[PDB]
Amino acid sequence: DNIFVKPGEDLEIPLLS
Amino acid sequence: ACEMCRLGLPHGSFFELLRDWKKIEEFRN
Amino acid sequence: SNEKIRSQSVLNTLETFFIKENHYDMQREESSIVNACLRYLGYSKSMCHEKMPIFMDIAFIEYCFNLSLDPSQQILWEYSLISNALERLENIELERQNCMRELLNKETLNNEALKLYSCAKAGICRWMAFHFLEQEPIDHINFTKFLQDWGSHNEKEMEALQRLSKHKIRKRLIYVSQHKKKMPWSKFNSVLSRYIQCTKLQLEVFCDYDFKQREIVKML
Ligand SMILES: [Zn+2]
Q1: Which of B19, B29, C21, C128 is placed for a possible disulfide with C212 were both Cys, Cβ 3.0 to 4.6 Å?
Q2: CB within 8 A of C216, min separation 6: which ones?
């Protein structure tokens, strides 16, 4: 049920500051 | 109704891919 | 048109060079045939308004970002090239989405590709922005053009990115160094590679593409 994204991987990108 | 077609000039996705491909190869050499 | 028949045959030849189980990379020994094929299509009057086959965009993305490697991968951060690459990546995603809408679960695969796509795209745009900010003087015209076309139109992000282009070079460089460390290119290399492989698998399994994924689909 996970093949390419690994369980608990964070693919959200910090905004710039 | 395309001006570059009527002018016989290269354009479109295949031409853009060609030029970009050349930029990459030149840079890597 | 016989020129169209010749062009389609050139496309079929490129397929046998471009389509890989893993990621394409140009071999010095294939350079002359590949280049001659690309140039022929690039000046072929009958291909000017033909659709680019998806295997060609995928090969471009693999070549442009050097996805065959896992080290500095000699990416050419040039505004015009990277803007074209993002448009190409978007065509791929557009086509993947249509495939899903007509051994593997569709809802899981679509969600994985979407998450990888969005991460990969944001990484490419951010590193293009970093390159702009690391030059002195800044090319503000192309920087702005690039942010409108591809910078996620958030209020306080483009707010800040345009303030930062007006900081002085030493401060821009300190800030760019910190954000590059917070988010190294190796992460986006991995996400983008996995996006391409995910897309290749879905297209083969669910539609009538062959991306030489047979040995991967079998292990499911
Ligand atoms: Zn035209």
Answers
A1: C21
A2: C21, C197, C201
